[PDB]
Design a protein around this ligand. Sequence first.
Ligand SMILES: OC[C@H]1O[C@H](O)[C@@H](O)[C@@H](O)[C@@H]1O
Length: 347
Amino acid sequence: MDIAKRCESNPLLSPKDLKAGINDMEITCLLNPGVFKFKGKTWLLLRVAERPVQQEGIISFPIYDEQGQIKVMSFAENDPDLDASDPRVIGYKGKNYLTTMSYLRLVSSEDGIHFHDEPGYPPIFGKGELEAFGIEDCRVASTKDGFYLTFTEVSSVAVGVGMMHTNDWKTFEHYGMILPPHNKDCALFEEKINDKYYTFHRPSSPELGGNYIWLAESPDLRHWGNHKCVATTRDGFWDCARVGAGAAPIKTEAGWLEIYHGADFNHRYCLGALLLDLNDPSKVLARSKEPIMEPIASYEQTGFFGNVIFTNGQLVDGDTITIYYGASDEVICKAELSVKEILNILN
Ligand SMILES: OC[C@H]1O[C@H](O)[C@@H](O)[C@@H](O)[C@@H]1O
């Protein structure tokens, strides 16, 4: 029931298309880019995942140590104290680790299809205790007061949400961890409502709850409260295991239109649509029963972690939504959707 016009050039960016940004590492994954416009170009703020060349029978990966220095961790695949069933997150002696380190990297484009690094625009790397395992999946809020980045901060003590601000994409201010663990999928709204700031977010409950889309509000972007549960998973549907907002919602006359991701217990991620009241964004007006984009293309089906569509950045020009997205947690893609057709599906 897929209604997305894929870019014929997909994929736009694969790991081999770029030079590694961490010393002695290679690029495993390009995914989940933020999206904005600046100095006449379309930009992606890529999630770039890197690790050492893998040796037979050894999982090895970078973290930052206490002095901020890359350090390589190694575990034997047959070590009985190792749980490596999932390629993204492992356990060893009761503690969790990632198989890669991620950072944020700017690429630019004149055509919105061929992308390249930009001299003077170096990448954004984890800093501090709370970003020791990297930063990920950055949403970019294009606003009157500039650009606001909301991304996953990962470390041995938390998956949480950080926020940064920039005017020129060279200088940044860090607002710290705005949402504690375990939380991600933080889609900041690009405008105020009732002179208040709003964001979607996505706390995960070990028990007594799940992985649902929530709402919070803020006077100042640094401090958040009045949390509300917007939309849960749906038992026995494609979005039965988790849901999360992608990019900021689009202002329409029907309401706030959010292209959200959902996944089942096999970790197959699809896109869906959510519509929310203009003045109370916690009120669900409508929700696509079926996905509006499933992982159908071949580059969407096999990779580092397969059967995954994921967008946390987009552009809107009239009726035409241009989403950029990660495919199989490996490569960058572009596709187009129609507001009118989405709203039509919701009635
Ligand atoms: O955030 C930690 C970890 O959580 C999930 O497993 C995925 O989103 C990974 O890509 C990510 O690195």
